[PDB]
Structure formats: structure tokens, C-alpha cells
Amino acid sequence: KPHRYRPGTVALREIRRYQKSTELLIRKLPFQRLVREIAQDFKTDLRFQSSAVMALQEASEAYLVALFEDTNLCAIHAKRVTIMPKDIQLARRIRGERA
Amino acid sequence: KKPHRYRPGTVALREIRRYQKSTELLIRKLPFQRLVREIAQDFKTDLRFQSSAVMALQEASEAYLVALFEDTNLCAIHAKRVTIMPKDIQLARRIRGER
Amino acid sequence: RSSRAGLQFPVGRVHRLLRKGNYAERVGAGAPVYLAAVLEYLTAEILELAGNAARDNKKTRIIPRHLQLAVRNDEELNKLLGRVTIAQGGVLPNIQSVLLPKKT
């Protein structure tokens, strides 16, 4: 008798897990290739220490995570429970991100 | 003959053209001055102020309040509302990190 | 002869202000020339945009309103000064488009 819990049990339970855990999410080699690719524009043929790639990973996840905190408060303040891109644009504008 | 009146919003929008257009200082100087002195009595007593310092706190008051209505107004417009409400003030204060 | 500088901005006064703020223990030769050149550039275009945006108010004296919108109109000068209030500045005429009264 297959029966999925619902739209929200995987969500809220998985929010309890991925708030509760500590480790770094987005994978090492695609992120590393990303930083090298953006790095090629300002200067050719760079080199990275590995821990610096972990550092850009950590600040990048913390900045995105805080952005989803705030855009979540944005869309909840519209009596919605779903992030939509104009909410992202709002928090980037409200915070001051929007140049 | 007796109507003449205007819509609720013509005096508002023309008033936005005037008070965005002008620049001068527009909270009255003696109630503001007494306000700064009465807030100032708590930390230390029997004070003395230069006048231009009271002008300077008047500038910080207008800058911080006015910018807070900028972001509060974008908050309430992002709710498909054209009227700000105190929860929007609370939202922009949490987004700027003022708690 | 006394004519030695013949450039722009006070190299000696800025040089004093680099030596007497405890930044390094010692300050090289070419540096206040460099920093003076940069500040003359920045000063120059900010007063230029206050120049055209002063002539748009048909005046001759630049008041701080002209420095307000003279900064806030260009992107880069605004991004250099985005945390700085200007006294007697006011705002640019920003109006959100939903407030514009529409009709037939």
C-alpha cells in the first residue's frame, strides 16, 4: 500500500536534519572548478591552497543561507510559504545588496 | 459649489513631489532639542550642547527614519499593499539586523 | 629657484598626514604624489557632475543638493558613498510605479 507522508513531512523533517547538521554541502570538485573558472578572468594561470577553496565554500554557503533566511521572512510576510525570485530581489534590495 | 475636494492621494502624491523636492529640516527645533536633552539626562546629568550638534542628531534622525520608510515602503508594496503597517517596520528592522 | 612642485594638491600637507597618523613606521617618496593624484581625480568628476547638475538648476553656486544628486546619479560614486549621509541633501525623486495614479 504505497503512501507518501505528504508535501511537508519530508520538508520539515529534512529542515530539522539540515538545520541540525554542520558539514559543507555543495561538492568539492564542481565548486573548485567554479572558483578556478571565475578566477581565470582577472588573471591567468592561478593556484589555490585547498583550505582557501574550503574558505570560499564556507563564506559562500553562509551568505546564501542567510539570504534564504531573509527571503523566507520576505515571502512569509506576503502570507506565502514559497520563495519566489522577486522576494530574493527584495531582500537583496532591502539589505542593500541591489547595487 | 462645495465639493472641490480632491481624491485621497492627490494631496499625497503632490505632497510627495514637494517633500521629496525640498530639503530643509522639518522636525521642530525646540521639541527635538528637548527630546535630545531628556534622552541625554539618563546616562549623565547636567549637560550642555552645542547647537550644531543638535542639528547633527536631527540629520541622523531624518536619515535613519526616512531610509527606514524607504525599505518599509518596499516591504508593503511587496505585499500588494499601498499602505504601510507596523509589521512592515518590524520586517525591515529585522532584515537590517536591528534586534 | 623655489618652483619645485608645480603640480596639483598639497603633496607636503598630505605627506605630513600620512606620516602623522601612525600608519606605517615609514612612508616612501612617491606615495603622496600618488594619493594626491587619485583624490584630484575623484574630486574632479564629483565637482563636474555637480557642475552639469548645478547648471540644470540654472544657478552658479553649487549647494549640497547638487552634491546629493550629483553623487546619487552615477552608479560608481554612489557605491563608493552608499553608507554616507549628506547633510542638507534630501533624496532623488524616486517614486514606486504602483503609486503612480493610472486611469483612462
Add this chain to the structure above:
Amino acid sequence: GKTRAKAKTRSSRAGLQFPVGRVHRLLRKGNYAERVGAGAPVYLAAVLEYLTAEILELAGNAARDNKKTRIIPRHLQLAVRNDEELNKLLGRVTIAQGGVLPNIQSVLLPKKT
């Protein structure tokens, strides 16, 4: 003709456990003032000892209260973010391997009976 005279250090001249000499050298060697006074890093080492004791204290309380015997940086995350004033000193500071203190907005919690 002697430079002994009870060869003592300092931190014990003030009753602390912070390096007055190392902090003192770090105040003289960052170009903060051409002269640096007599008892300034005594005062400053006192302030930093209080702050260190506060954060490590709350990570100790949270360290028992999440059933370990060793402070990990996660306990520094929710150790710092639970006091108000320590959070206000560190509100612009990310700390790595910290994660997020568990916050759930009220509309996300289920609308059960």
C-alpha cells in the same frame, strides 16, 4: 652588580593568565600610538580574559547539555548565538563549521489539532 632581584614575569604581578608582554608588544607594533602607557595591556588582557571565559563558559554549559566532553565549533555557534550581547558583538562574523541555530518560523509548523 646583579639583574636577578626575584626574576618574576607579570601576569602574576596582576593575577591573570594572559601574556602582558606579548599583548604589549602587539600594541606597540601595529602603529596605534607613538607612545604606549604603563598599564594598558594589563587592562586589555583583563577584558579579553573575561570575554574568553564567557564564551568558553557557555560552550561548556552547552557542551554538557548536548552530551559531549569536548568543545567543537558547533557549540561555539549555538554558544555565542544564544546570549544576546555576545551575538551583538559578533553579529557580522561567520564562524566556520557552525551551521545554524534551530529557528523555525511559525507558519511552517503544522496546522494540526
Add this chain to the structure above:
Amino acid sequence: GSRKCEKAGCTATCPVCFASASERCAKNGYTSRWYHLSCGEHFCNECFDHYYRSHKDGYDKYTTWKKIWTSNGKTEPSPKAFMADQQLPYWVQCTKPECRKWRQLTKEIQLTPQIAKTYRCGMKSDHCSLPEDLRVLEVSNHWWYSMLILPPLLKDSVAAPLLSAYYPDCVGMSPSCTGMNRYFQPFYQPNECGKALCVRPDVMELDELYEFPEYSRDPTMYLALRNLILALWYTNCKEALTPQKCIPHIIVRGLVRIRCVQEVERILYFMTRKGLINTGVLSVGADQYLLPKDYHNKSVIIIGAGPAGLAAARQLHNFGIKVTVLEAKDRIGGRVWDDKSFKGVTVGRGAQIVNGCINNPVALMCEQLGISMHKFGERCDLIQEGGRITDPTIDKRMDFHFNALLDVVSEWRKDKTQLQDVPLGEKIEEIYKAFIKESGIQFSELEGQVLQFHLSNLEYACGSNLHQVSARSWDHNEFFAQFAGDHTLLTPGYSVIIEKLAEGLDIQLKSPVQCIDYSGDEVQVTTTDGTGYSAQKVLVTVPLALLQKGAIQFNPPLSEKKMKAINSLGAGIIEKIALQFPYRFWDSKVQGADFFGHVPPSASKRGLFAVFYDMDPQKKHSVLMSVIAGEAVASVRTLDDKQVLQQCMATLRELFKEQEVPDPTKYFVTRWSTDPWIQMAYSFVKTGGSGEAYDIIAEDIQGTVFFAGEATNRHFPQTVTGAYLSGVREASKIAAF
């Protein structure tokens, strides 16, 4: 620990703690230090620490109080202050007549006025027989107060709500605390311009320091009691204020309350004698006298039964002093004389207006009588013969110029002495001509006529043509604080107040005094028919004109100094006409205004009915009143009443030219000028004269012959109020002896 007190000279041979706040209280035993509040009140070092030390249970209570005492007061919150204000037990005096013992209330009991009002010993055996705490007697030793650390501060003073602008502890009240006639404003408010009959809540007046020198160092206790007394008087001015009524309203902790209660009686009697309270038309009879039997043995003859004579007589009588009033005429009142024969209205032949009701004795007396006054509106159109209301711009233009002329006069006089005095009228004229010369400006005939109206209004005020009045001194009295607030029409008339003052006094009518002899042991007074009177003291209140005429023979004669002052003032004069009509013909044009002005056709005629007064504020009856002033008083002296009436009606038909005016059906024309025992309306300063003249005339002779009357009041000349106050003044002087 010790058994001795910190304070040097304290006679407490056995200190005990009144606080018992600490579980460690020393009681009657040993303590490291006994803290002294008074010779009979101490608290031990343990209870001190109980509040003072942060780690003690009473610290909260002391810090909270210390905060209220900060947002509310200007004295430092010391533990001793906290004790005297918060912990000291109350004391209350047994009200049983044959007991009257003072009792300490248990520390939890909060004394109220109701408790004090009815308290008897034991109120929670013969409780009244238990000996009085020995500490009570000590309080009445002069050195007792000297060894009080802090002055008493009253709680819930009746004066409090009137003083919310002052620091409570600066006016004798406690920082930890908290429908009157609008005309009662006894206390100066901070940063106020002067106004008449006001006292500073925080400072003793000169006469007060004189009577109570012991308070010059610290006036706290006095001010609290004086302020309370005034507040109580004004709260209910219809009853004599007695110590019994005050005592329940004296709320303060400690034995000091006993000292406060003991002082209230002294201050009450001083206030009464001086005429600050228990005054006005308040009447008091045998066994109700307002001053102790100590003042009673003495006697007085008062000459004249106008406002001044009757004021002094009322005061002295209420004091318990033997008084006889001798009046020349067949009626009392003097320049107060009301006609009650007009339909539905009372019309004064003499005084009827009250100039500045705030703190005015007249306003008080109206309160006591339940009388309402009518406040004048501002509007007074300047109507021309015949019909035209003066253009508002012309009106404003000439008002400005008129007053500008007064400014330059006040500027001219600054460096002139009496020996260089010139008539106000002449000075104004010259300045006016010299201005038209200077600036080519030229005024129309009407503009000149409007200026004449204003001049006429000055003449009405002074009771004289302006060429008689001093440029230097015409307005001398304004050097002193004047009566602020509404000017009113005393619609029932001053006679009601007069009647009330005189009621039950010993007054002899038709007894004109001719001789006063004060050369012997007591004053011999003889009337014109030879009737003899005698008393220890005599007060003369006859009008200035009668003093000038020398109608009373003084032996020994008045001093040359007095005579010069008497003659340096002018016996000012105006006359009134009242007219009754069949209907209110002026309503259309006048539109409810209390009065209207009459623009003079010429300078010579300017004082002939310059202002007309609508004598019914209810706008129902039809009575007009007008005045004859300046030159016009002379022009009317040979005219009979009918002729004056004819000229007034001719004037009205001019003022209301474009309409009809009914005939009057009843009228009067006054002849004060030729009333033998009066011969005037009110005094003014003649050219060469000084305001000091009023003081000189006021000066008693050898504490035996006293003077009152409007012409003796330098602060408040001319008025019923001023005359009334001069009588109160003299009653105080006479009663002191």
C-alpha cells in the same frame, strides 16, 4: 557598640530604634552607631545598613524611593531623609478636650486627615490616663528644632496641586507624594510677570521675615504651613479658617509634626491680622473673634463709611476690637451708591466696574456672596456723529500713533525731576505737532478726531483734563504689580458688598466729624453738632478733596510734609448719566458689544459722553450709561439735569443718525462734584506730584491717627479695591499695637 548618640548636644540619655527594620535591630541596646533624626528619634546602625547596603533586604525599598525622589525633588536622598519621609512613626493628638495628649501611632499605621480629625487615645482601660511620652514636651524647647537634622516636608498638602511647577521640597512638600474659582491665584508661577496680591511659594515676604526671624536660615517649615493655610482659605473662603481645621491637613512623620502643629496657630493669626485669610465679607461674632484675647483691649473710631472705612471696621470687628464708625451722610457707601429703581437692573451712580479680577478682594467677596460678574468683551467701535462706524484701518492707524505718543513721553520723563514736570496733555500736544513738522505726514480731520477720543479716554481714567495731570507720574502705580485678568461689570452693584461689610457694625450716620484732638491720653473726636466721641486710636478715610478743603480740624495740625503730599494729588472727577428706554434701539448697529465709543466733533467736547455702556449683559433690558470727563465736567456745572439729558439724547440721535431713537423714560445725572462730603470721583497725580504722595498720606501719626482711602493706596489708587485694601492695611497696623 555604644549607648551614646552621634549628635553633639543631644539630650537623649537612652537612644532606642524607631525603625526595627533589620532582623538585627539593636532596639534599646548596643549598636556601633546611633543615627540621630531629632532629640527623641534615632535608628541603629543595623537598620541603617538594612536600607543603605546593597546586600540587605531593605535596599530595594531605599533605591526605589531614591529614584522617585530624583524625578521629583532637588534635595539629596540620604538615608536620614528616607527615614524621616518613609519610616518614622506618625504622631497624633488626642481630641478629647480634657486630655489632648500626643500619641505615637504604630509603625504600620498611615496617618490621614480623617484619623487626626477624630482621634482619641487607644483608637486602634482609661487610655487617656496613660502618661504622655516624655519626648512630647521636649518638642516645645526652642533648641529642639535646632537639633532636628532635616526640615519637615508635608504630605498631600492642599497647596500641592497649585504648585506642580515647583520642586515639592523647595516649597516644604515631599517629592514622594501624588474646582477653585479661576480668580484665585495666590502663588506666583515660575517665570511669571508680576501680578497683584501674589506670594512666592519658595520665599518669605519681608513682613514675614520681620515677624518670624527664626526662619531666615531655613524657611522650609514656615512656607509649607503658610502655603497650606492659603490653599485652605481659598479652597473654602466662606468659613473662618481655624487651627482645628488646619491640623488634620498637616501630614508629616515624626515628632516634628507636633512642632508643625504648634506653629500653625502663630502663622494663622499673622495671616489673619495682615488680611490674607479670614477676610472679605466673612462675618464673625461674639466668641468667634479671629484674633486671641490679647489683641482685644483697645478702641478705635473710624471716620467715613465708604469701602475703606468699612473694610477696616469689618477687619477690626472680626478681630475682637472695639470699633465705632462715624459717617457724615445719611447713608453708608461713599462713592459706592447704586440705583436699584431701574427695571430689572442695578445701575451704579458711582463705582460699578472691577478692574482686574485675579486675586482681587472684590472677586473673593463675590465668591463668598455667590455673586456672578460679567466679563467685558473687547469690542468697542468708534462711532462718528452721525452714524458712521470708523474704518478699521483708520482705527488701527490712530491707536498706533496715540500710543506712540505715550512711548515718547515715557522716554522724555526718564531724566526729569518733579521740579521739571510738565502736564501730560501739553507734552502729548507738543510731541504731536513736532512729529507732523518732522514728517510731512498730515492726518485728516477724522483721524485727528479719533486721536481726541483716545485723549478723552485718558481723561476719564485720571478724572481730569490732561493739562492738569503729571507727565512724569500719571501712571506711577504701574511700577508695582497690578491686578491681572478680567475687567468685569459688577452687575448686582458694589452696594451688596458694602451692605455686607457694614452689617452689624456700630455705625453712626449723619455724624460729620469736625474736630480730631490727639494731644491727650486718648483721641477726642467732635462732630459738627458738638457731639463727643473718644477712643485710643482714630482712622480717617475721608476723600482727598475733604482733606484738601481742611474740613476736619486736627490738633496738633497735620505736618507740612503731609499737606504738601495732600495738595500734590488731584481730586479727580467724572459724572455719570444713566438712561432707560422703551426698547433696545442700539442692537442692530452695536451687535451685542458691551460698549461703544463716540468720536468727538472737537477737542473741547471730547469728554462729553465718550463711551456708552450697555447695562444689561443679558441683552434684555434697555439701560445705557455714559460718562462726563475732562473739560466737559466744567461745561455741565451750570446745566440742570434735564439739560444734560437733552445733550446726551442729542448725542445719541447723532450716533444713530440713520435710525430713530425712542425717548428715555427714566434717567439720572450724578453730581459728585458738589456732594459736600465727597466732591470728587478718584485721585490722580497733579503736575509736580509723585506717587510717593500716596505713601506720605498713608503714614500714621504717632501710631495714634491712621489714614486710609483710595488716595492713600500707592499700589492701587482710585479703586474700590484699592480703598478696601487700604482699610485692611490700616486694620493690620492698628491691631498690631
Add this chain to the structure above:
Amino acid sequence: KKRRKTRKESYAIYVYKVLKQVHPDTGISSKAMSIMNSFVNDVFERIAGEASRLAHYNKRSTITSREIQTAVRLLLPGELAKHAVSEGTKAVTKYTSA
């Protein structure tokens, strides 16, 4: 393998000592130790810089303990300021008594 390294500094044994003072039988991990190290450096340049410009405003050229008291009363929020000043005066006076 066999060659001189490069002398280095830290705060780590001091943070370990205060850990011995507060909860004496309790461990700490290595990256948390580097967190506290960078924390002590971060606060150290905060009040050091506040001492720099706060001493620059008054036309002085000397950093004394009054300046550090003011600057701690600027960065430390409130209750965190007060006990820092009490420990600071206790360490100044407790130093000075010798």
C-alpha cells in the same frame, strides 16, 4: 626533514588555561581552538583600533588605561561592558598594589 622551521605564536595554551579555570575537566577540539584564536585577534584589533582613533581625537599620542576603558565601553554591549570594567579596574589596581 632535518632543518630549522619558523618560530610561531598563538593564544592556544592561554585559551586552554581559561578552559581549565571554568570547566576544569572538559576538552576542546582543534578547529574550535583556531576559532578562539581568530576571535581573540579580531577583538584585539577592534579595541586596538578604537584606542587608535579614540586617542587620535583628543590630540594625544599615548594609549593609557582610560582610553581602553572608554573603547571597551564603546564596543562591549552593556552588561558585557560593566564586568569587563570591573575586572579591568581589579587588574589595574591588583597589578598596582605590588
Add this chain to the structure above:
Amino acid sequence: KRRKTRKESYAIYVYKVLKQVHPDTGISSKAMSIMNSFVNDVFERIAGEASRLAHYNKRSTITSREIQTAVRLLLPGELAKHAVSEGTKAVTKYTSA
């Protein structure tokens, strides 16, 4: 009798650059003091960044190259390019004399 101290500004220099750009067009005093505190603000940002940048490379000397890097960190983009290009114009125009 006795006069009073003073205190420098940039107001004559700001006036001179204004005379370079739009020469027949004046300036008011509040805007002059705003420009004054503006150039003090940028001066302390760039000198401060020179301090934080010299304080990393174990160096205790602020030459012009550190000001080049610190300008290439503060000023965004285009005016960084022309700013640094004018800086090379003034170093090279200086030393070639």
C-alpha cells in the same frame, strides 16, 4: 589684542579643481565643508587600507604601489581605472622631471 589658532582645510584646493572643470561657476560654503569632510573620508579609507595592506606582507613602508593596490580595492571599476592611470601619470610625470 591676542588673535586665535587656525586649522587647515582643502577648500582652496577644491576651489582650484572647480576652477579647472567649470571655471565660471561658483560654490557655496556648506557644500565646501561637505567636500572637505568627503576628501578627509576618502583619505582615511585609502590610508587605512594602506595600513591593513602593509600589515600583511611583513612590511612597514607605504610606497605608491600599495596605494595603487588599495585604490584598486576601494574604488569600483571604471574610476579605479582612470584613478590608477592618473596615478601612474603623476608618479611618472613626477620622476621624469
Add this chain to the structure above:
Amino acid sequence: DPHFHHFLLSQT
């Protein structure tokens, strides 16, 4: 300041 004094309390 004679101006303000209460009339009945300045009779010395």
C-alpha cells in the same frame, strides 16, 4: 525687586 512683592506683606 519691589515690583512683585505682595502688597499686604511689604508694609514692613
Add this chain to the structure above:
Amino acid sequence: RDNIQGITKPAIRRLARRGGVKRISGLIYEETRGVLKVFLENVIRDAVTYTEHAKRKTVTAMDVVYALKRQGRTLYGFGG
């Protein structure tokens, strides 16, 4: 009395008009006085801290331009 209240309801209206706010709800003014009160409490606290350190009884304008600089709200036009 009640200095805070001295910030008038039309003044908060006027600052909203400069901000580009059309319509203002009911309890905006209470919270507006509260927010202005908090901001002036922090700025005045830091300015007093800047003024007690020079041991001077008088607060100047350079005091509070410094205090506004340190909170990341720099304000030109008064020096420094």
C-alpha cells in the same frame, strides 16, 4: 512634558512624505517614536562616552559626527 510625544504626528507624516509613503496606518506613530527613541539612545550614549573621555561638560558636534561614523552612518557637513 512627554518630550518624545513632541515628535508630532504631522512630522512623522512629513518624513513619510519625503520617503515616498502614500498612506499611513494607525499605530505607526507609537512605533515611530519608539524606533527614533532607540536610535537616539544609542547615538547619544556613544556621544556621551565620547564626551566624558575628554572630561568636558559640553558635547560638541565633532563628538556626534564621530559617534555616527563608528556606527556606520557617516554624516558630512560638520567636520571630520
Add this chain to the structure above:
Amino acid sequence: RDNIQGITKPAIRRLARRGGVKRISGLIYEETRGVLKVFLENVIRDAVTYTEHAKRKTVTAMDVVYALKRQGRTLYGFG
């Protein structure tokens, strides 16, 4: 393939669910790649200048922690 998509769709889901986000719309992912791209462009534009000033060809950890500190986003745990 995803030249820069790397931040797979479930990876952005995992970061959002660390942030406490229940339901994610459709175009969120491309904008999220854009915002992350802008942030990294500024951070390593500033970091590469620190690596260029020492004339060194290898970016270190102190480089990016210093350049993060300057942008007001200070990050402990590396130096």
C-alpha cells in the same frame, strides 16, 4: 556541462533547507547561480589583488579571509 550549474538543483535545495525554507519555486535556481556568481566575483576579484600585491601566483587562505574581512563578512577558522 553546467559550466557553472555545479550548484545542482538539490544542492541549492540543501542550502535552502539549512536556511529553513519549505517550498522552492522554479526559477529560483538560475537566480541563485547568478547571486552566487556575483558574490564570488566580488570576493575573488578582491582576493586575487591581495595575491597579486605580494607578486605571488598562489592564492592562500589568509588571502580570502582578509578579503572577506574587508567586505564586512569576517570568517574565523582559517587565520
Add this chain to the structure above:
Amino acid sequence: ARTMQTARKSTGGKAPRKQLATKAAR
């Protein structure tokens, strides 16, 4: 005296106004 005037009071020639400045005032 001027004080006798009710209707159409004169105003010119008045001495400067004095204002009690006590310390007991909050």
C-alpha cells in the same frame, strides 16, 4: 491712572516687563 481704563485701554508708555526667575522651579 491707566489701570482705570476698561474700554479701549491705552498700551503705550509702559516700562519693560519683569519676569520672576526662581530656582525652585522644575
Add this chain to the structure above:
DNA sequence: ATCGGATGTATATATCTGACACGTGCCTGGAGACTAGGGAGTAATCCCCTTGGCGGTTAAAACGCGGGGGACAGCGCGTACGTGCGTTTAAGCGGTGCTAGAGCTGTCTACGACCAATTGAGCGGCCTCGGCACCGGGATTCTCGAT
């Protein structure tokens, strides 16, 4: 959907008045010409630590496929606040007075750099085991589909 009061707002013209651009004087900080120790460019090397490749497994990513609930447009109904007019009312002004304290300048002095010998103290190399993972098994709890 057009037309007209009306009405707030843009357009010359004087007008005082004063704030700014400017001329006089001065004094001290810019500069100019030396020296000197040291910070740093510059070479070369040590080695190590970044890059690169390659194979083996596979957790994660991609993708297809239900399906339902969340966004959103309509819509009716209340209320609250914008608009405008009579009342007040205290803020601005504008002068007048008083002296507390910023600021100046001088006095005298306790205190931080300069060296310079002396040493243990924190730091790196190098052990060593106990706490956290970590399967591995097992009872609890919560959810979701039933009554």
C-alpha cells in the same frame, strides 16, 4: 468619453542684502640640501605542496511520473485614515543677561623608549591512548492512513 472652474504651478521683474569671492598681512610648515642605518629588492636554493593522471566504487544527481495544495484573481464588506475647515497654541523670533566652561598658554613633573645583559617559557618534534564515530542491534515515537 470632452469642457470648464480652478488651481496649484511654471515664468519675467525688481529689490535688498548678505555670503562669497577677494585683497592685505603674516608665520610656520613645506621644502631643500645633506647623512645613515636598515628595509627591502634581488639571487639562488630547498623541498613541499599544488597540480595531474588513472583506475575502482558508488552516493548523488538526473529524470520520469503521480498528484495536491499553494498562488492568485475575484469579490464583498468593514473601518480608518486622508481632506478640509474652525480653534488653539506654543514654536519661532528677537532681543536681553549671566556666567560655566572651552580653549589658551604656561609650569613642572612623573614616565616611556634605548640599550643591554639574563633566562625560562611557549613552541615544535614526538609519542599515546580514550572519546567520538560507527556500525550493529533494538525499543520508542510519531505520522499517516484507516476507523
Add this chain to the structure above:
DNA sequence: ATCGAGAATCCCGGTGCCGAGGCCGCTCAATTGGTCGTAGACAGCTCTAGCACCGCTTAAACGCACGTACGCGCTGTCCCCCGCGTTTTAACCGCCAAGGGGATTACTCCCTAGTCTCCAGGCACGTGTCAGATATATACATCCGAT
């Protein structure tokens, strides 16, 4: 409305292993002890600028009516995104190779603090205009009914 699969989550138990903690040498930065010009507490004046006070006008603030439109709750309707099996597929991991570049230590040397004097650049200080606010009268631009 309330009760069972059953699946995720929490509770002990041996294992291991390795990273946390500790110990032994050991360079060098703290330390101690004197000097020394000097920055700065400290005293005192001064005068000036902040605070206090009082009267007058009035723009602005306050307060009452009123109406409509803005907020907001219900209703339906669609679809986009959540959830879960199935494939694949590329990330992770171990190890092996090579050297380019970071860190080090030394070498040499130019260069920027440091001194003393010399003078004009800017900066304090009168000054008198020409730019702008302020009426002041005057013809457009758009709003708002009412058609």
C-alpha cells in the same frame, strides 16, 4: 470523531583509531634595571558661547466630520513543484609523478627617516558686491467634476 503498519529516530555495546592531550629540548622574546626628553596632568585666566528669560506673531499643531477605498477573508481553479522509484554518472578516494612556486637565508645597496634653516602659501581677517530669496504680478498644465 480515534486506533494500528511502519518507518524514522533514539538508546546501549564493542572497536578502532586517530586526533586531543601531554612531555622533552630549546631559541628569544619577555624581563629587569636603569636613563631622559617630553607629553601631559595641572593651575589659572578669558571671554565667548551656551543657557536662561520675557513678550509678540503666528505657522503649525490640534481636533471634528466624512466618505471611500484599502485591507482582508472567502472561493474557486489551475500547475508547478514535492515526492518517490530507476538509471547513470560523475564525484569521491588511493596512489602514483613532476615540478613550479612558496618559504628561507643570505647579499648588497639604495632610500627614506632625521636636522636645520629659509621663505612664501595658505590662512586669519576686513570688504562689498551679484545670486538668490522674496514678493508680485502673470499666463500655462493638469485635476476634477459634470456632461
